[PDB]
Design a binder for these strands. Structure first.
Ligand SMILES: [Mg+2]
Ligand SMILES: [Mg+2]
Ligand SMILES: [Mg+2]
Ligand SMILES: [Mg+2]
Ligand SMILES: [Mg+2]
Ligand SMILES: [Mg+2]
Ligand SMILES: [Mg+2]
Ligand SMILES: [Mg+2]
Ligand SMILES: [Mg+2]
Ligand SMILES: [Mg+2]
Ligand SMILES: [Mg+2]
Ligand SMILES: [Mg+2]
Ligand SMILES: [Mg+2]
Ligand SMILES: [Mg+2]
Ligand SMILES: [Mg+2]
Ligand SMILES: [Mg+2]
Ligand SMILES: [Mg+2]
Ligand SMILES: [Mg+2]
Ligand SMILES: [Mg+2]
Ligand SMILES: [Mg+2]
Ligand SMILES: [Mg+2]
Ligand SMILES: [Mg+2]
Ligand SMILES: [Mg+2]
Ligand SMILES: [Mg+2]
Ligand SMILES: [Mg+2]
Ligand SMILES: [Mg+2]
Ligand SMILES: [Mg+2]
Ligand SMILES: [Mg+2]
Ligand SMILES: [Mg+2]
Ligand SMILES: [Mg+2]
Ligand SMILES: [Mg+2]
Ligand SMILES: [Mg+2]
Ligand SMILES: [Mg+2]
Ligand SMILES: [Mg+2]
Ligand SMILES: [Mg+2]
Ligand SMILES: [Mg+2]
Ligand SMILES: [Mg+2]
Ligand SMILES: [Mg+2]
Ligand SMILES: [Mg+2]
Ligand SMILES: [Mg+2]
Ligand SMILES: [Mg+2]
Ligand SMILES: [Mg+2]
Ligand SMILES: [Mg+2]
Ligand SMILES: [Mg+2]
Ligand SMILES: [Mg+2]
Ligand SMILES: [Mg+2]
Ligand SMILES: [Mg+2]
Ligand SMILES: [Mg+2]
Ligand SMILES: [Mg+2]
Ligand SMILES: [Mg+2]
Ligand SMILES: [Mg+2]
Ligand SMILES: [Mg+2]
Ligand SMILES: [Mg+2]
Ligand SMILES: [Mg+2]
Ligand SMILES: [Mg+2]
Ligand SMILES: [Mg+2]
Ligand SMILES: [Mg+2]
Ligand SMILES: [Mg+2]
Ligand SMILES: [Mg+2]
Ligand SMILES: [Mg+2]
Ligand SMILES: [Mg+2]
Ligand SMILES: [Mg+2]
Ligand SMILES: [Mg+2]
Ligand SMILES: [Mg+2]
Ligand SMILES: [Mg+2]
Ligand SMILES: [Mg+2]
Ligand SMILES: [Mg+2]
Ligand SMILES: [Mg+2]
Ligand SMILES: [Mg+2]
Ligand SMILES: [Mg+2]
Ligand SMILES: [Mg+2]
Ligand SMILES: [Mg+2]
Ligand SMILES: [Mg+2]
Ligand SMILES: [Mg+2]
Ligand SMILES: [Mg+2]
Ligand SMILES: [Mg+2]
Ligand SMILES: [Mg+2]
Ligand SMILES: [Mg+2]
Ligand SMILES: [Mg+2]
Ligand SMILES: [Mg+2]
Ligand SMILES: [Mg+2]
Ligand SMILES: [Mg+2]
Ligand SMILES: [Mg+2]
Ligand SMILES: [Mg+2]
Ligand SMILES: [Mg+2]
Ligand SMILES: [Mg+2]
Ligand SMILES: [Mg+2]
Ligand SMILES: [Mg+2]
Ligand SMILES: [Mg+2]
Ligand SMILES: [Mg+2]
Ligand SMILES: [Mg+2]
Ligand SMILES: [Mg+2]
Ligand SMILES: [Mg+2]
Ligand SMILES: [Mg+2]
Ligand SMILES: [Mg+2]
Ligand SMILES: [Mg+2]
Ligand SMILES: [Mg+2]
Ligand SMILES: [Mg+2]
Ligand SMILES: [Mg+2]
Ligand SMILES: [Mg+2]
Ligand SMILES: [Mg+2]
Ligand SMILES: [Mg+2]
Ligand SMILES: [Mg+2]
Ligand SMILES: [Mg+2]
Ligand SMILES: [Mg+2]
Ligand SMILES: [Mg+2]
Ligand SMILES: [Mg+2]
Ligand SMILES: [Mg+2]
Ligand SMILES: [Mg+2]
Ligand SMILES: [Mg+2]
Ligand SMILES: [Mg+2]
Ligand SMILES: [Mg+2]
Ligand SMILES: [Mg+2]
Ligand SMILES: [Mg+2]
Ligand SMILES: [Mg+2]
Ligand SMILES: [Mg+2]
Ligand SMILES: [Mg+2]
Ligand SMILES: [Mg+2]
Ligand SMILES: [Mg+2]
Ligand SMILES: [Mg+2]
Ligand SMILES: [Mg+2]
Ligand SMILES: [Mg+2]
Ligand SMILES: [Mg+2]
Ligand SMILES: [Mg+2]
Ligand SMILES: [Mg+2]
Ligand SMILES: [Mg+2]
Ligand SMILES: [Mg+2]
Ligand SMILES: [Mg+2]
Ligand SMILES: [Mg+2]
Ligand SMILES: [Mg+2]
Ligand SMILES: [Mg+2]
Ligand SMILES: [Mg+2]
Ligand SMILES: [Mg+2]
Ligand SMILES: [Mg+2]
Ligand SMILES: [Mg+2]
Ligand SMILES: [Mg+2]
Ligand SMILES: [Mg+2]
Ligand SMILES: [Mg+2]
Ligand SMILES: [Mg+2]
Ligand SMILES: [Mg+2]
Ligand SMILES: [Mg+2]
Ligand SMILES: [Mg+2]
Ligand SMILES: [Mg+2]
Ligand SMILES: [Mg+2]
Ligand SMILES: [Mg+2]
Ligand SMILES: [Mg+2]
Ligand SMILES: [Mg+2]
Ligand SMILES: [Mg+2]
Ligand SMILES: [Mg+2]
Ligand SMILES: [Mg+2]
Ligand SMILES: [Mg+2]
Ligand SMILES: [Mg+2]
Ligand SMILES: [Mg+2]
Ligand SMILES: [Mg+2]
Ligand SMILES: [Mg+2]
Ligand SMILES: [Mg+2]
Ligand SMILES: [Mg+2]
Ligand SMILES: [Mg+2]
Ligand SMILES: [Mg+2]
Ligand SMILES: [Mg+2]
Ligand SMILES: [Mg+2]
Ligand SMILES: [Mg+2]
Ligand SMILES: [Mg+2]
Ligand SMILES: [Mg+2]
Ligand SMILES: [Mg+2]
Ligand SMILES: [Mg+2]
Ligand SMILES: [Mg+2]
Ligand SMILES: [Mg+2]
Ligand SMILES: [Mg+2]
Ligand SMILES: [Mg+2]
Ligand SMILES: [Mg+2]
Ligand SMILES: [Mg+2]
Ligand SMILES: [Mg+2]
Ligand SMILES: [Mg+2]
Ligand SMILES: [Mg+2]
Ligand SMILES: [Mg+2]
Ligand SMILES: [Mg+2]
Ligand SMILES: [Mg+2]
Ligand SMILES: [Mg+2]
Ligand SMILES: [Mg+2]
Ligand SMILES: [Mg+2]
Ligand SMILES: [Mg+2]
Ligand SMILES: [Mg+2]
Ligand SMILES: [Mg+2]
Ligand SMILES: [Mg+2]
Ligand SMILES: [Mg+2]
Ligand SMILES: [Mg+2]
Ligand SMILES: [Mg+2]
Ligand SMILES: [Mg+2]
Ligand SMILES: [Mg+2]
Ligand SMILES: [Mg+2]
Ligand SMILES: [Mg+2]
Ligand SMILES: [Mg+2]
Ligand SMILES: [Mg+2]
Ligand SMILES: [Mg+2]
Ligand SMILES: [Mg+2]
Ligand SMILES: [Mg+2]
Ligand SMILES: [Mg+2]
Ligand SMILES: [Mg+2]
Ligand SMILES: [Mg+2]
Ligand SMILES: [Mg+2]
Ligand SMILES: [Mg+2]
Ligand SMILES: [Mg+2]
Ligand SMILES: [Mg+2]
Ligand SMILES: [Mg+2]
Ligand SMILES: [Mg+2]
Ligand SMILES: [Mg+2]
Ligand SMILES: [Mg+2]
Ligand SMILES: [Mg+2]
Ligand SMILES: [Mg+2]
Ligand SMILES: [Mg+2]
Ligand SMILES: [Mg+2]
Ligand SMILES: [Mg+2]
Ligand SMILES: [Mg+2]
Ligand SMILES: [Mg+2]
Ligand SMILES: [Mg+2]
Ligand SMILES: [Mg+2]
Ligand SMILES: [Mg+2]
Ligand SMILES: [Mg+2]
Ligand SMILES: [Mg+2]
Ligand SMILES: [Mg+2]
Ligand SMILES: [Mg+2]
Ligand SMILES: [Mg+2]
Ligand SMILES: [Mg+2]
Ligand SMILES: [Mg+2]
Ligand SMILES: [Mg+2]
Ligand SMILES: [Mg+2]
Ligand SMILES: [Mg+2]
Ligand SMILES: [Mg+2]
Ligand SMILES: [Mg+2]
Ligand SMILES: [Mg+2]
Ligand SMILES: [Mg+2]
Ligand SMILES: [Mg+2]
Ligand SMILES: [Mg+2]
Ligand SMILES: [Mg+2]
Ligand SMILES: [Mg+2]
Ligand SMILES: [Mg+2]
Ligand SMILES: [Mg+2]
Ligand SMILES: [Mg+2]
Ligand SMILES: [Mg+2]
Ligand SMILES: [Mg+2]
Ligand SMILES: [Mg+2]
Ligand SMILES: [Mg+2]
Ligand SMILES: [Mg+2]
Ligand SMILES: [Mg+2]
Ligand SMILES: [Mg+2]
Ligand SMILES: [Mg+2]
Ligand SMILES: [Mg+2]
Ligand SMILES: [Mg+2]
Ligand SMILES: [Mg+2]
Ligand SMILES: [Mg+2]
Ligand SMILES: [Mg+2]
Ligand SMILES: [Mg+2]
Ligand SMILES: [Mg+2]
Ligand SMILES: [Mg+2]
Ligand SMILES: [Mg+2]
Ligand SMILES: [Mg+2]
Ligand SMILES: [Mg+2]
Ligand SMILES: [Mg+2]
Ligand SMILES: [Mg+2]
Ligand SMILES: [Mg+2]
Ligand SMILES: [Mg+2]
Ligand SMILES: [Mg+2]
Ligand SMILES: [Mg+2]
Ligand SMILES: [Mg+2]
Lengths: 275, 48
RNA sequence: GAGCUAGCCCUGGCCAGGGUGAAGCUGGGGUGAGACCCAGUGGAGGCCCGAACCGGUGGGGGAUGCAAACCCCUCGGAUGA
RNA sequence: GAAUGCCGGCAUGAGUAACGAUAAAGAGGGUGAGAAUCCCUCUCGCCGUAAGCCCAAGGGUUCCUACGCAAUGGUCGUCAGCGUAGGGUUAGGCGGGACCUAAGGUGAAGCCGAAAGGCGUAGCCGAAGGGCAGCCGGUUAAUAUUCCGGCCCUUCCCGCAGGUGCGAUGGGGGGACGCUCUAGGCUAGGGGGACCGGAGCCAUGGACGAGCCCGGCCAGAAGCGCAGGGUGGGAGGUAGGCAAAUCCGCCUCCCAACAAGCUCUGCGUGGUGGGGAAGCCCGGGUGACAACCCCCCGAAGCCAGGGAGCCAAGAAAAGCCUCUAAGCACAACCUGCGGGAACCCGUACCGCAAACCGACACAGGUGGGCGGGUGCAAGAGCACUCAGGCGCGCGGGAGAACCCUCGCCAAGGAACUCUGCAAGUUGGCCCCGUAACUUCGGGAGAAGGGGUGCUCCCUGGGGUGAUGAGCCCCGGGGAGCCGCAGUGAACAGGCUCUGGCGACUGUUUACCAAAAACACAGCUCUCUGCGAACUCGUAAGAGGAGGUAUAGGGAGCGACGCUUGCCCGGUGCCGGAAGGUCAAGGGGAGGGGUGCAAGCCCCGAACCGAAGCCCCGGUGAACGGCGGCCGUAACUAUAACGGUCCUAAGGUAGCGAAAUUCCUUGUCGGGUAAGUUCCGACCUGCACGAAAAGCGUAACGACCGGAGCGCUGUCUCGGCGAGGGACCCGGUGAAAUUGAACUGGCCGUGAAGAUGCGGCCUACCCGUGGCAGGACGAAAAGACCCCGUGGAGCUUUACUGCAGCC
RNA sequence: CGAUGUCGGCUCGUCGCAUCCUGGGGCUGAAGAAGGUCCCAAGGGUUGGGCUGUUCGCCCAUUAAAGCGGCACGCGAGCUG
RNA sequence: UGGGAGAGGGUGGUGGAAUUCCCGGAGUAGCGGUGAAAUGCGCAGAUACCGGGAGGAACGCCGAUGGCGAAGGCAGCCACCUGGUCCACCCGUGACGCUGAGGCGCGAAAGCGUGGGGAGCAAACCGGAUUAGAUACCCGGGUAGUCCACGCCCUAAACG
RNA sequence: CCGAGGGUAGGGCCCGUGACUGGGGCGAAGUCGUAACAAGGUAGCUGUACCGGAAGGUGCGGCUGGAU
């Protein structure tokens, strides 16, 4: 869990890498991969719409099963646990007794060789998917649909989880990884357990180069530019912001809320995120 | 040093060529214009 | 108009030779079991020296130039952002 | 007659600068009207990881031959990439198309936009990626994997035989993949041979030799051999691969497993087809029945889709194989053999350059492969040299100043100067040895030394082979020889102490700044619940992201260490269903116009009425801010203490004459003979201070300071020498500039600095090499400065709008 | 202002004299030696370093002395920067 | 060998009381706080009362002058894993013992690193009083920390 | 060959001294406050943490060498 290096270069001092001790299979399932179109943060106009992106390692996209209500009742075996460079979590290879193979994202504690299954009758067991309606109150859960049959939307980053606080009517009450209290529909699926690779957040990139490998190009501060570029541009020598700190596009960036006020989901958010 | 003209027959025909001109409205008014003026060639000649 | 230049995308190519010697593994020692120590093996690194390649630090020359940015000596990077 | 006018023509500078890398020339013989310059020969020098050779791009006849020399060629020209004419580019296998997909482009369906048009699934296009059948020699003045010769191979059509449930744009398998390191066995290439073939050669003192010099191969179908890659067999069940399925996937059972077998490549061999040197003789002919063998080195290439490790986790589609469905089983497909069929485009030549990009036959720029030998530890480094290719399209003299590039220097050794700028010194390898400090890696090539050649003798280990010889590779010991000197030539660190800034490798103002700037891992704040926020777009649609709070946006800060205090009164943001204000709308007390009137028409109070603002709170790693005066201790001085005025609160730790200190070279101490700089301190900090972060910090730095050692032409202080220019001669022959000129000094005068006016002095006419004081010398209608109700970029609590959001 | 290059240094001088030294004097509160002050005099001479961009100034070691000013704050078609 | 008592230790689970906050209801002019007050909070609907929810920490009565441990120290309840210890029987070994410089391990609180977690409490800090002053005692707030995991620190009126 | 020692270079220990700086001891009658000894007028002592002109205060946990 997080390997360290001796300081035999200036960057190996702090650089840490994952232990990869859970991975059992070091090459992907040929039938479950497809090319990932690297965009560089450029839209169909060719315009950079998200700055500072590009230049990262080539990746194959692994098709992930975020429904699991496709195969209600059909058990699967845990065949392997694999690297996925498109997400922070690890992924899990399932050999269904159907003979079909799919990927899910690996919850914490899932062991290769285990049987998993999905549906209302399913056991409350790490890796099983049920509608939220049927999971006991108080159970930690992950990969949660936000609406019925629309696909797992919540709590899939490494180490994340959502806890079931209670239910009312057709809806259950979840505590999201952010701490928001939200009602989610009881028919929405979810997988009991928390996402694996919890130590993911304790990784120290160590040097600029690792950012470049992840497709992250250098980010240049506003205070470093000229007035034609940014509200914080200009000044003789260094300079404080000299105005409410702002984005490149004018708007304030220290506390200004930006959620849409009349958004129809407000009726289902019970409490705004903690901390 | 490296100068600005680096000829390229594919780049030339695809950028200034007859069919590139005919695709866009400003491309056609170019040909229209050069036809009106009596240009001997409406488009850069390139060997292919 | 991006055949210059800047960034990104797709697909290929290049990086003489030498130097240092991380993790791991093996054996030995150690202990209740360990941490750990030693030797061997090993060959990591925006590691070291240095051609190609990419640069342009100091000085001299050139200044109706060989050249609308060049030449000489010197110098930086050279498995990597 | 003037517009730095416009167009052209012709002058001046001037027979002046220059004639484009300092790799270099000399003679003889030809040709011709004419020759330093063209051809031939001999001698000399230059490149040789190229300055040689082969591809690609771009160029487009420049290629070959004949006949030419007006112009082009920096001179000449009989020559030429120039002029005229004729000739020259040959493919089923090479490259591209009749094949496939990548980004991207286009785009039936569909969506969007005043118009023009913008999107968009499939599909289509799109290559230097995937896929696919030709190798060796000969021939032409000029093409050749293209013609020819030899030996092989692919596809399509039709036929014959044998075989099988045949059949696809649908299902599946495969194609199919990174980085670093790397095994075995080969081949490319190379070194050697006392072996094999060769025309010869004996010089000048010696050698007739196990002498010198030259060469000792290339291609090849089946088969076979060595080395590899790939690959389990059978059965039963089956609900999954959007129909089917005997295929694939999943379960079970049996047998086989570092094998074997089958299959596919590489290398070797292989019938056979080629090639074949020096030297001599006129590209050729001979040599020659040429010989064509043995040993060693050996790839980064081959076997290959090999192996191991690691994280940043490494295209697609077709060919191909298999499964089947419609259909069809007179079929159709598979295998073997045979005949026939096989189209379009490129192919000349240059290609690190005189043919490409730079206006030039321009010291610049241009992607891929081959790139031999010896020595130097290695190598593509360096020196010389092979094959090959050149002497750079003005020359001949002379041997001044001065300039450039270079060599040396007595004594001194930084005294030079803003500065050791520059140039010395050091310099590779092996061995000995190596400090503070430190994040324990480092600092480190620290520093400082010793060794280095040749000869003879003794000897250890490895590779090949066989275990031995030979060859090759690492070494160990002893005795000697020579010189000033043994990395004897060439290539190859000067070192140390101490500050500032920045953690570091990186990045930048293409063309005056490479830095202390930008970036950067890391820290914090903040927004964002997913049709996310945010961004581009009128929109549709995209990016975000096929991601989901361990995630994505924004902002500041900038490894790490120890830390980051007090102020919420104002501005910002956040919270606040009350109150205050508030537009359109609602409401209609009450008025007005008009009509005979019913009516029509107009104004209009109270009152209801959002956001925003007011108001009440919160909030600093939000914008920001963090006092003044007077007095006081038993020497003096200074105030722990106190008084009072003000504030939203009065600067904490740490640091401080600093990249900040004005007075300032503050004062004291160190260093020096002497120190406005430097280092260490003090603290009245003009005008440090805590993420516009404060204080430190090992390592790192073409950053900027100060010192020391070493060593020097930097200097006292200059001298001599070399080559390339300058100078002279023949050839070719510019430029900016220019009112005209018959163009001296002084002292005055003048629009205030006179060759040109006055007075005086001096002065025969014309050049050449030189120096720069003047011609307010040239260049550019001053960038500074001001003026113009000139312009543009930028800012905000300037005005007024607009997008966007509410 | 259709341009008169702006500090200092180096190099190269040349002039003035209100003289720093050397030569000639008078007065002295000049015994001598050595000074002071003033007059005449521009022939010649007027050093090397540390600091700073510096001119200037201070300092070290000397000296007969270590002069002051002008020449576009002399001199960038002479150099530096 | 057969038995016993125990907050000895580690892991996971779980139970109710209370406090704070959130939502709903009902209700009104104060609540709070002290020596006395003020700050603070409350008509924008607090305090007091009822129902519901979230979360943390500590375990009332038993409880004792009690028990366990070498010491530090250990207290709801359940299970698992584990140490020490006492009694009985008189069964086995036959001095196998005592101590212990160095070594190693454990070691309250506070404190440190990286993640969490955060109800109450509370250094710092802010505010109200008191006072000549009040950088205190008292009151209203309040950040580290107190809690969990891993890793350090290794101190004590670590005392009988 | 060894060899007194000389020279070049780098280390280790000790002593003296140094602008300035840190606390310490001592000093007949200084300034500020009153922490401790009585419950010393907030029981004290304590290890540690943070803070403050100064003694000290406060948190956390500990000791009685704490009174009633
Ligand atoms: Mg690390
Ligand atoms: Mg370490
Ligand atoms: Mg893992
Ligand atoms: Mg696929
Ligand atoms: Mg994508
Ligand atoms: Mg598009
Ligand atoms: Mg477009
Ligand atoms: Mg963006
Ligand atoms: Mg981008
Ligand atoms: Mg992710
Ligand atoms: Mg993963
Ligand atoms: Mg829902
Ligand atoms: Mg992180
Ligand atoms: Mg990446
Ligand atoms: Mg980032
Ligand atoms: Mg940045
Ligand atoms: Mg800026
Ligand atoms: Mg800037
Ligand atoms: Mg712009
Ligand atoms: Mg603007
Ligand atoms: Mg702006
Ligand atoms: Mg600004
Ligand atoms: Mg600025
Ligand atoms: Mg400033
Ligand atoms: Mg700036
Ligand atoms: Mg700021
Ligand atoms: Mg400001
Ligand atoms: Mg702003
Ligand atoms: Mg917005
Ligand atoms: Mg929320
Ligand atoms: Mg360029
Ligand atoms: Mg051009
Ligand atoms: Mg180009
Ligand atoms: Mg082209
Ligand atoms: Mg092309
Ligand atoms: Mg092109
Ligand atoms: Mg186009
Ligand atoms: Mg076109
Ligand atoms: Mg049109
Ligand atoms: Mg039209
Ligand atoms: Mg034309
Ligand atoms: Mg025509
Ligand atoms: Mg055109
Ligand atoms: Mg290009
Ligand atoms: Mg390289
Ligand atoms: Mg070495
Ligand atoms: Mg290993
Ligand atoms: Mg490197
Ligand atoms: Mg090195
Ligand atoms: Mg360059
Ligand atoms: Mg240069
Ligand atoms: Mg130099
Ligand atoms: Mg120039
Ligand atoms: Mg050059
Ligand atoms: Mg050079
Ligand atoms: Mg170098
Ligand atoms: Mg290097
Ligand atoms: Mg290298
Ligand atoms: Mg006139
Ligand atoms: Mg004009
Ligand atoms: Mg004109
Ligand atoms: Mg003209
Ligand atoms: Mg004419
Ligand atoms: Mg003319
Ligand atoms: Mg003339
Ligand atoms: Mg002349
Ligand atoms: Mg000239
Ligand atoms: Mg020239
Ligand atoms: Mg040259
Ligand atoms: Mg040469
Ligand atoms: Mg000759
Ligand atoms: Mg000749
Ligand atoms: Mg003739
Ligand atoms: Mg000639
Ligand atoms: Mg001639
Ligand atoms: Mg010739
Ligand atoms: Mg060579
Ligand atoms: Mg051309
Ligand atoms: Mg001619
Ligand atoms: Mg001629
Ligand atoms: Mg003619
Ligand atoms: Mg000519
Ligand atoms: Mg020419
Ligand atoms: Mg031809
Ligand atoms: Mg052919
Ligand atoms: Mg056809
Ligand atoms: Mg296609
Ligand atoms: Mg259209
Ligand atoms: Mg196309
Ligand atoms: Mg195509
Ligand atoms: Mg192709
Ligand atoms: Mg590929
Ligand atoms: Mg082909
Ligand atoms: Mg062949
Ligand atoms: Mg041939
Ligand atoms: Mg098929
Ligand atoms: Mg594959
Ligand atoms: Mg793949
Ligand atoms: Mg990698
Ligand atoms: Mg071969
Ligand atoms: Mg060899
Ligand atoms: Mg089936
Ligand atoms: Mg192959
Ligand atoms: Mg013959
Ligand atoms: Mg290679
Ligand atoms: Mg391969
Ligand atoms: Mg595709
Ligand atoms: Mg039939
Ligand atoms: Mg068959
Ligand atoms: Mg055709
Ligand atoms: Mg050809
Ligand atoms: Mg060629
Ligand atoms: Mg070149
Ligand atoms: Mg090339
Ligand atoms: Mg040529
Ligand atoms: Mg040019
Ligand atoms: Mg030439
Ligand atoms: Mg050229
Ligand atoms: Mg090149
Ligand atoms: Mg050879
Ligand atoms: Mg070498
Ligand atoms: Mg020449
Ligand atoms: Mg040349
Ligand atoms: Mg020439
Ligand atoms: Mg001469
Ligand atoms: Mg030269
Ligand atoms: Mg020499
Ligand atoms: Mg000599
Ligand atoms: Mg000398
Ligand atoms: Mg010296
Ligand atoms: Mg010396
Ligand atoms: Mg010096
Ligand atoms: Mg000098
Ligand atoms: Mg300088
Ligand atoms: Mg040297
Ligand atoms: Mg050297
Ligand atoms: Mg030292
Ligand atoms: Mg040092
Ligand atoms: Mg240090
Ligand atoms: Mg160390
Ligand atoms: Mg060494
Ligand atoms: Mg050395
Ligand atoms: Mg020796
Ligand atoms: Mg010799
Ligand atoms: Mg070096
Ligand atoms: Mg830096
Ligand atoms: Mg920087
Ligand atoms: Mg710093
Ligand atoms: Mg730092
Ligand atoms: Mg680098
Ligand atoms: Mg620049
Ligand atoms: Mg510039
Ligand atoms: Mg420029
Ligand atoms: Mg420059
Ligand atoms: Mg700069
Ligand atoms: Mg640099
Ligand atoms: Mg920058
Ligand atoms: Mg940095
Ligand atoms: Mg940080
Ligand atoms: Mg954070
Ligand atoms: Mg926009
Ligand atoms: Mg997407
Ligand atoms: Mg940094
Ligand atoms: Mg930065
Ligand atoms: Mg430290
Ligand atoms: Mg405030
Ligand atoms: Mg406030
Ligand atoms: Mg405020
Ligand atoms: Mg109204
Ligand atoms: Mg302000
Ligand atoms: Mg303010
Ligand atoms: Mg007094
Ligand atoms: Mg304070
Ligand atoms: Mg503090
Ligand atoms: Mg100071
Ligand atoms: Mg000072
Ligand atoms: Mg400072
Ligand atoms: Mg400064
Ligand atoms: Mg300051
Ligand atoms: Mg100062
Ligand atoms: Mg000053
Ligand atoms: Mg001084
Ligand atoms: Mg001193
Ligand atoms: Mg002072
Ligand atoms: Mg500052
Ligand atoms: Mg600042
Ligand atoms: Mg430092
Ligand atoms: Mg340092
Ligand atoms: Mg650097
Ligand atoms: Mg630097
Ligand atoms: Mg210096
Ligand atoms: Mg020095
Ligand atoms: Mg000289
Ligand atoms: Mg000469
Ligand atoms: Mg002539
Ligand atoms: Mg001519
Ligand atoms: Mg005249
Ligand atoms: Mg005249
Ligand atoms: Mg005259
Ligand atoms: Mg005259
Ligand atoms: Mg006047
Ligand atoms: Mg005059
Ligand atoms: Mg005159
Ligand atoms: Mg006149
Ligand atoms: Mg007159
Ligand atoms: Mg006159
Ligand atoms: Mg006159
Ligand atoms: Mg005269
Ligand atoms: Mg002359
Ligand atoms: Mg002359
Ligand atoms: Mg002159
Ligand atoms: Mg001049
Ligand atoms: Mg003049
Ligand atoms: Mg004038
Ligand atoms: Mg002048
Ligand atoms: Mg002049
Ligand atoms: Mg004008
Ligand atoms: Mg003007
Ligand atoms: Mg101008
Ligand atoms: Mg300017
Ligand atoms: Mg200006
Ligand atoms: Mg003015
Ligand atoms: Mg005005
Ligand atoms: Mg006016
Ligand atoms: Mg104006
Ligand atoms: Mg002017
Ligand atoms: Mg003019
Ligand atoms: Mg002018
Ligand atoms: Mg006298
Ligand atoms: Mg006397
Ligand atoms: Mg006397
Ligand atoms: Mg007198
Ligand atoms: Mg005189
Ligand atoms: Mg001075
Ligand atoms: Mg001056
Ligand atoms: Mg001064
Ligand atoms: Mg005297
Ligand atoms: Mg003067
Ligand atoms: Mg004057
Ligand atoms: Mg002047
Ligand atoms: Mg003046
Ligand atoms: Mg002046
Ligand atoms: Mg002057
Ligand atoms: Mg100048
Ligand atoms: Mg000057
Ligand atoms: Mg001038
Ligand atoms: Mg300057
Ligand atoms: Mg300069
Ligand atoms: Mg009230
Ligand atoms: Mg009310
Ligand atoms: Mg909570
Ligand atoms: Mg239980
Ligand atoms: Mg017994
Ligand atoms: Mg004991
Ligand atoms: Mg504790
Ligand atoms: Mg108060
Ligand atoms: Mg009072
Ligand atoms: Mg402890
Ligand atoms: Mg006790
Ligand atoms: Mg001696
Ligand atoms: Mg007390
Ligand atoms: Mg008391
Ligand atoms: Mg008291
Ligand atoms: Mg007390
Ligand atoms: Mg306190």
């Amino acid at each position: 869990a997080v390997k360290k290096f001796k300081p035999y270069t200036p960057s190996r001092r702090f650089m840490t890498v994952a232990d990869f001790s859970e991975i059992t299979k070091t090459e992907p399932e040929k039938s479950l991969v497809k090319p990932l179109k690297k965009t560089g943060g450029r839209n169909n106009q060719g315009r950079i719409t998200v700055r500072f992106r590009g230049g990262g390692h080539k990746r194959l996209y692994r098709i992930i099963d975020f429904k699991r209500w496709d195969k209600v009742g059909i058990p699967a075996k845990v065949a392997a646990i694999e690297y996925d460079p498109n997400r922070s979590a690890r992924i899990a290879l399932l050999h269904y007794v159907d003979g079909e193979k799919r990927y899910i994202i690996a919850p914490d504690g899932l062991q290769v060789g285990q049987q998993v299954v999905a549906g209302p009758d399913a056991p409350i067991q790490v890796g099983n998917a049920l509608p939220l309606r049927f999971i006991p109150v108080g159970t930690v859960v992950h990969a949660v649909e936000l609406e019925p049959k629309k696909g797992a939307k919540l709590a899939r980053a490494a180490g994340t989880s959502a806890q079931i606080q209670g239910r009312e009517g057709d809806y259950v009450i979840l505590r999201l990884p952010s701490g928001e209290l939200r009602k989610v529909h009881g028919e929405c699926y979810a997988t009991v357990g928390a996402v694996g690779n919890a130590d993911h957040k304790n990784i120290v990139l160590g040097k600029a180069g690792r950012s470049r490998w992840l497709g992250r190009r250098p980010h240049v501060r506003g205070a470093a530019m000229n007035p034609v570029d940014h509200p914080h541009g200009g000044g003789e020598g260094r300079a404080p912001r000299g105005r409410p700190p702002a984005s490149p596009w004018g708007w304030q960036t220290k506390g200004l809320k930006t959620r849409k006020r009349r958004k129809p989901s407000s009726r289902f958010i019970i409490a705004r995120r903690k901390k | 040093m490296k100068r600005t003209w680096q000829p390229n027959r594919r780049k030339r025909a695809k950028t200034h060529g007859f069919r590139a001109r005919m695709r866009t409205p400003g491309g056609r008014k170019v040909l229209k214009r050069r036809r009106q003026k009596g240009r001997w060639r409406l488009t850069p000649a390139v060997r292919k």
